[PDB]
Design an enzyme around this catalytic site. Structure first.
Site, PDB file in Angstrom:
ATOM      1  N   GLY A 183       0.812  -1.234   0.000  1.00 18.98           N
ATOM      2  CA  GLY A 183       0.000   0.000   0.000  1.00 18.98           C
ATOM      3  C   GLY A 183       0.836   1.270   0.000  1.00 18.98           C
ATOM      4  O   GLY A 183       2.068   1.182  -0.175  1.00 18.98           O
ATOM      5  N   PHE A 219       4.225  10.000   1.937  1.00 17.42           N
ATOM      6  CA  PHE A 219       5.478   9.961   1.133  1.00 17.42           C
ATOM      7  C   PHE A 219       5.890   8.512   0.812  1.00 17.42           C
ATOM      8  O   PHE A 219       6.615   8.309  -0.182  1.00 17.42           O
ATOM      9  CB  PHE A 219       6.610  10.680   1.874  1.00 17.42           C
ATOM     10  CG  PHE A 219       6.314  12.098   2.300  1.00 17.42           C
ATOM     11  CD1 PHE A 219       6.233  13.119   1.363  1.00 17.42           C
ATOM     12  CD2 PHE A 219       6.141  12.421   3.640  1.00 17.42           C
ATOM     13  CE1 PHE A 219       5.968  14.424   1.754  1.00 17.42           C
ATOM     14  CE2 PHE A 219       5.879  13.727   4.029  1.00 17.42           C
ATOM     15  CZ  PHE A 219       5.793  14.727   3.086  1.00 17.42           C
ATOM     16  N   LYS A 245       5.718   4.460  -0.092  1.00 17.32           N
ATOM     17  CA  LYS A 245       5.169   3.204  -0.667  1.00 17.32           C
ATOM     18  C   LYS A 245       5.707   2.033   0.165  1.00 17.32           C
ATOM     19  O   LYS A 245       6.927   2.018   0.444  1.00 17.32           O
ATOM     20  CB  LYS A 245       5.555   3.053  -2.142  1.00 17.32           C
ATOM     21  CG  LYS A 245       4.779   3.936  -3.107  1.00 17.32           C
ATOM     22  CD  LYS A 245       5.177   3.724  -4.550  1.00 17.32           C
ATOM     23  CE  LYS A 245       4.552   4.729  -5.492  1.00 17.32           C
ATOM     24  NZ  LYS A 245       4.875   4.412  -6.901  1.00 17.32           N
ATOM     25  N   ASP A 276      -1.798  10.266  16.744  1.00 19.09           N
ATOM     26  CA  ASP A 276      -2.659   9.877  15.595  1.00 19.09           C
ATOM     27  C   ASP A 276      -3.080   8.411  15.710  1.00 19.09           C
ATOM     28  O   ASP A 276      -2.983   7.677  14.707  1.00 19.09           O
ATOM     29  CB  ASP A 276      -1.971  10.154  14.264  1.00 19.09           C
ATOM     30  CG  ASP A 276      -2.943  10.153  13.097  1.00 19.09           C
ATOM     31  OD1 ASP A 276      -4.181  10.200  13.352  1.00 19.09           O
ATOM     32  OD2 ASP A 276      -2.466  10.064  11.954  1.00 19.09           O
ATOM     33  N   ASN A 278      -3.800   2.855  11.703  1.00 14.34           N
ATOM     34  CA  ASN A 278      -2.465   2.859  12.367  1.00 14.34           C
ATOM     35  C   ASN A 278      -2.372   1.678  13.339  1.00 14.34           C
ATOM     36  O   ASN A 278      -1.340   1.548  14.034  1.00 14.34           O
ATOM     37  CB  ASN A 278      -2.217   4.160  13.138  1.00 14.34           C
ATOM     38  CG  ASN A 278      -1.880   5.337  12.248  1.00 14.34           C
ATOM     39  OD1 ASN A 278      -1.919   6.484  12.694  1.00 14.34           O
ATOM     40  ND2 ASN A 278      -1.552   5.074  10.992  1.00 14.34           N
ATOM     41  N   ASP A 319       3.044   3.793  12.516  1.00 16.11           N
ATOM     42  CA  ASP A 319       3.051   5.183  11.991  1.00 16.11           C
ATOM     43  C   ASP A 319       3.284   6.204  13.112  1.00 16.11           C
ATOM     44  O   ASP A 319       2.306   6.826  13.564  1.00 16.11           O
ATOM     45  CB  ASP A 319       1.756   5.513  11.250  1.00 16.11           C
ATOM     46  CG  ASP A 319       1.836   6.827  10.487  1.00 16.11           C
ATOM     47  OD1 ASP A 319       2.921   7.488  10.523  1.00 16.11           O
ATOM     48  OD2 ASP A 319       0.821   7.181   9.856  1.00 16.11           O
TER      49      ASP A 319
END
Ligand SMILES: Nc1ncnc2c1ncn2[C@@H]1O[C@H](COP(=O)(O)OP(=O)(O)NP(=O)(O)O)[C@@H](O)[C@H]1O
Ligand SMILES: [Zn+2]
EC number: 2.7.11.21
Length: 294
Positions: free
Chosen positions: A24, A28, A30, A140, A145, A158
Site C-alpha cells: 500500500g 510519502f 510506498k 494519531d 495505524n 506510523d
C-alpha cells in the site's frame, strides 16, 4: 519520478532485501513486502523518495519519526528492524503485519462483538501504556495505524505525528499534521499532552462497538464543531459498562479523562469476557465464542 531498486542493500549491515508484493501507500511512503536474500525472513519495507524530502522541515519530521520508532520495542508496537538510504530513497525495515489494519476489519465487519472490542482495545491500551511510560505521545491513534499480524495481534504503527515529552507537565503547542480522532484541546489550540491518545482510544472504542465514528459529518469543520461542543450520542443497545468507559474517555477536559494506566482496571475489561486469541474467520465472520462444537 525515479523507479525503486528491485534489491535494497544496507551497506553498513551488508544485508540485501528483495522487493516483494506491494502492500500500500500513505503520504510519502510506498510499502512492500521485502525478504532478506540470506535468511529469507520477510519484513514490511516503507520506501520514501528524497524528491519529497527537499525541505529541511519535512526531513526533520522523518528523522524524528525514525528517532522515536527505533527506540521502541513492545509486542503491541510495530517492530523497528532498521533503516538505510541511497541518493533517491529512505528505506525503513518494519515488522510485517500480514493482516492489514483495524480499518480494513471495520470496513468489512462494522460493529464488532463486545469481546472482540475488549480483545483489541486491551492490546491497543497495552501498546499505548508502553508508549506513555516511555514519554511518547502517538497523537494519531486510528484504525489505519493499528496493524494486525498473522495471529490478529495489534501492532501500533506510523509514528509520523509522534512526539517525546521532555519534562513533567510539558504542554505541546504544535501538532504539524491532521490526526483523524483529533482531541478538543488540539482543535482549541489550548496545548496538549498524553490525554489526546486516551481521547483517540475513546473514539476507537466507540467506532469498534457502534460501527461508525462518534463525530462523523460530511464536512471536517462541522465534525470539529461537534468535537468542540462534545456533540455525540452512544446508541442505547451499547452495554452501560462500555457506554460509561467511552463517556469517561471522550470528555472535553483532558484532566477529567482516565490516564492510560487506569483503563485496563475498568469494569469493561475486569467484568467481561476477553478472548485469549481470535481465529482468522473473525476478519469476515462474527465469532459466537461457543463453549464447544456441534
Ligand atoms: N508493518 C506493516 N505491515 C504491513 N503493511 C504496512 C506496514 N506499515 C505500513 N504498511 C502499509 O503501508 C501504508 C502506509 O504506511 P504507514 O505506516 O501507515 O504510513 P503513512 O504513509 O503515514 N500512512 P497513514 O497511516 O495513512 O497515515 C499502511 O497504511 C499500510 O497499508
Ligand atoms: Zn510544520
Amino acid at each position: 519520478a525515479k523507479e525503486i531498486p528491485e534489491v535494497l542493500v544496507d551497506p553498513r549491515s551488508r544485508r540485501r532485501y528483495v522487493r516483494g508484493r506491494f502492500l500500500g501507500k500513505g503520504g510519502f511512503a510506498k510499502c512492500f513486502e521485502i525478504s532478506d536474500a540470506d535468511t529469507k525472513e520477510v519484513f514490511a519495507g516503507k520506501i520514501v523518495p528524497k524528491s519529497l524530502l527537499l525541505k529541511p522541515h519535512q526531513r526533520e519530521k522523518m528523522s524524528m519519526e525514525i528517532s522515536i520508532h527505533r527506540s521502541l520495542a513492545h509486542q503491541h508496537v510495530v517492530g523497528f528492524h532498521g533503516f538505510f538510504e541511497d541518493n533517491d530513497f529512505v528505506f525503513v525495515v518494519l515488522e510485517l503485519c500480514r493482516r492489514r489494519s483495524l480499518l480494513e476489519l471495520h470496513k468489512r465487519r462494522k460493529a464488532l462483538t463486545e469481546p472482540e472490542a475488549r480483545y483489541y482495545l486491551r492490546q491497543i491500551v497495552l501498546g499505548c501504556q508502553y508508549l506513555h511510560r516511555n514519554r511518547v505521545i502517538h497523537r494519531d491513534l486510528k484504525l489505519g495505524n493499528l496493524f494486525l499480524n498473522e495471529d490478529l495481534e495489534v501492532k501500533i504503527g506510523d509514528f509520523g505525528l509522534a512526539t517525546k515529552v521532555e519534562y513533567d507537565g510539558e504542554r505541546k503547542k504544535v501538532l504539524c499534521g491532521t490526526p483523524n480522532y483529533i482531541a478538543p484541546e488540539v482543535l482549541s489550540k489550548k496545548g496538549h499532552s498524553f490525554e489526546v491518545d486516551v481521547w483517540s482510544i475513546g473514539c476507537i472504542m466507540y467506532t469498534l462497538l457502534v460501527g461508525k465514528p462518534p463525530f462523523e459529518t460530511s464536512c471536517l469543520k462541522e465534525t470539529y464543531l461537534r468535537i468542540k461542543k462534545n456533540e455525540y450520542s452512544i446508541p442505547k443497545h451499547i452495554n452501560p459498562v462500555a457506554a460509561s468507559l467511552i463517556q469517561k474517555m471522550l470528555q472535553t477536559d483532558p484532566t477529567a479523562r482516565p490516564t492510560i494506566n487506569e483503563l485496563l482496571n475498568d469494569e469493561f475489561f475486569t467484568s467481561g469476557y476477553i478472548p485469549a486469541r481470535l481465529p482468522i474467520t473473525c476478519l469476515t465472520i462474527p465469532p459466537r465464542f461457543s463453549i464447544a462444537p456441534s
